[PDB]
Scaffold this active site. Structure first.
Site, PDB file in Angstrom:
ATOM      1  CG  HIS C 198      -2.046   0.993   1.120  1.00  0.00           C
ATOM      2  ND1 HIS C 198      -3.092   0.891   0.233  1.00  0.00           N
ATOM      3  CD2 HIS C 198      -2.260   2.128   1.823  1.00  0.00           C
ATOM      4  CE1 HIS C 198      -3.901   1.923   0.388  1.00  0.00           C
ATOM      5  NE2 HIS C 198      -3.418   2.689   1.347  1.00  0.00           N
ATOM      6  CG  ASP C 202      -4.798   4.695  -4.893  1.00  0.00           C
ATOM      7  OD1 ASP C 202      -5.049   4.592  -3.674  1.00  0.00           O
ATOM      8  OD2 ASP C 202      -5.303   5.580  -5.616  1.00  0.00           O
TER       9      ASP C 202
END
Lengths: 234, 226, 226, 234
Positions: C198, C202
């Protein structure tokens, strides 16, 4: 990447392509089609294939039904048996029937001749094709028994073509081309059944054979395969 | 008739007097192509700004069959009596515009997909429409598709473009009753034709060639497999 | 525990302390793959001498999704705080043999088809089985498929191979009732998982990535289109 | 061809990846799931969407049903509203409810805050989301109204994920993740119907929130979306 390379063709392939173009520049070839219902042949092969193998040690195929029906149609109309020789501008009739059978082996195409088809039955034709099929397979097939045919069957139907146009073996006047067997819907008796049917073709010389004589010829082959008991009758 | 029509009729008779042409037929079931065009035509237009047609399925299936049998790709030159193999595939596409017939060439079809073929036909279709189509990109083809099926012919015999050895002729799509699984359904089917040179291509090699084009249009997932 | 198992447990905890891993799930309908394997498995064995499996459909669909979104192909190197893009695709395939887990690499997946992938897995599967599998072809992968579905897990969370940024986890195939067209049918479906970094990827790019793998397995003709 | 090229990441992306790893190294995150039947929300939107547009000039969506049901569950269990500050090792209760709403625009993710959700209705929430959605779209969205949230809704369901695990916004203690709506067969009343259902997820801090309090929290959000008349009752 754009690569091309010139490999040559030998002197044997020179003459094969030479004889092929002489067959088109000599005779005016046309083609006519029809359609045969193969139901009475398959149930003949469905019940008698076991007593045929025990008594003759052979396989019962489709090919012997087309060779015997072809000798029946040729002895009724002798004009298809004829050949025009342009040396003396002559029309050469014949009284014997020698059907050439193109049997495509692994090596390639070969066209041996079955001699004197008038007196045979299905058992005699099946012996002639089977043992001569073994000769050309292991390449002991002589030259002297590849010429002099008067009519030619061409099985291009072991690969699955629908229909097509064959090419005349140049010392002859006609050629029959059989094709693949497919199940198609058929209007019989006012109802829509499904029956295995074959398209056939006949390439003929229009210099010699009339346009109506080629239709009557191929219609007579159909009657002796849709009902093979006509060979005992008329 | 002008001197241009003199040469067109002259080249046409040289194509018959050179090679021994024969013709073979078959039949393609067009059901898996139409539902491919039924559900993916909207995401194709949004993402590429192109139309999804039948033509790109026949061009990609033709490059698949030619790279398996290279003898159909060959050409006999009677100058030195030679057999010229090729390793590239350039499919000529006859696209009949209002002006008349034109036969431009799609170059290097081996690496493309349906998206690349559709770009090539669409922008080059606009070139020949307003007559900016050059001469240098009309020659050197190795195989030819002939869409005479936008007018409604059932089947027929095409004519070989004389620097080539074979030609495929597609035709109209009709709904005919079909015996499938022992039952009588109605499915849209097309007759196809293949005119080949019998000096070079064998009689059994032309049947196997057209049978391979049929397998890649009745089921287009074979292009990912064998 | 020996010094080899010391480093394996050491590399495993470094993969969690480096990247912020999350997981997202979806569900694939495996009907179009099984009937592809139902009718073409016999002509595939005769022509290639190989077996037609599920694995080559997931490897080819993974190279399709990675070349559309290159950010999943990227790697953050924290040495110079850099974002290393790549232009090649090397999918690592975990093939659990009797000895244990091994993770060899399939090189340059962009140009292959199902026939090329099946050759690469089969002969390299024989290498690691009799323990001739080199070290030099076990590193440099950019994406990883994890078949933990040959044992019958429903779904679960995989672990990222630490020089990479994402991993796909396929699972067991079960028959479950499915609402299709307003009716309740029974169709073989698979849960899949995607564990992603992450820091780099995205939250909406991981969902779009796994949704694109689903479209190329529910309908494998998209690989020819867009 | 094997080409790779190093493009750098700016100092803003440095801090985003830095805050992200601090959220995992601070709190012990776990995740729990459930499943909501969305039938009573869709027919509320089926018959009242026309009188809502005429009277308010707004669109009636799913989002305002989840924000109002979240403020209902938080005011019943205040421990989910709490935050552990590790500066003085303190437990900071709050008496106000500020739900942050992640609304992914074309530019990217933004997380503005809806202030004082306790007194609103569906009409007030829909005004707040719509006009503030227009602010961040044309990039006039201030910094001062992006912080201080106490709970977070994450719509990752406009892309079609089945279910997944979200990440906690680090000044908070919990986050709700809604997902895509699919039609699946459902056993209701002993019969198999087809009803549109959604998977939801709740990522919580296990240092502060008990394992049974997170289950009761997400079960209370489900009761106020399967039947939105509970907001008038208990």
């Amino acid at each position: 990447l754009r690569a091309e390379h010139r490999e040559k063709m030998n002197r044997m392939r020179q003459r094969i392509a030479q004889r092929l173009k002489e067959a088109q520049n000599t005779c005016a070839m046309l083609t006519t089609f029809n359609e045969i219902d193969m139901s009475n042949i398959q149930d003949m092969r469905a019940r008698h294939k076991e007593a045929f193998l025990k008594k003759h040690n052979l396989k019962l195929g489709f090919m012997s039904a087309f060779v015997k029906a072809s000798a029946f149609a040729l002895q009724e109309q002798p004009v298809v048996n004829a050949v025009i020789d342009d040396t003396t501008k002559e029309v050469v009739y014949r009284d014997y029937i020698d059907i050439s059978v193109a049997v495509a082996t692994p090596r390639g195409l070969v066209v041996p001749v079955i001699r004197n088809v008038e007196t045979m039955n299905y058992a005699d034709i099946e012996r002639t094709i089977s043992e001569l099929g073994e000769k050309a397979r292991k390449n002991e097939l002589a030259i002297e028994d590849m010429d002099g045919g008067t009519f030619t069957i061409s099985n291009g139907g072991v690969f699955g073509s629908l229909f097509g146009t064959p090419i005349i073996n140049p010392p002859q006047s006609a050629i029959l081309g059989m094709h693949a067997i497919v199940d198609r819907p058929v209007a019989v008796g006012g109802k829509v059944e499904i029956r295995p049917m074959m398209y056939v073709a006949l390439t003929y010389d229009h210099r010699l054979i009339d346009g109506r004589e080629a239709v009557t010829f191929l219609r007579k082959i159909k009657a002796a395969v849709e009902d093979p008991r006509v060979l005992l009758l008329d």
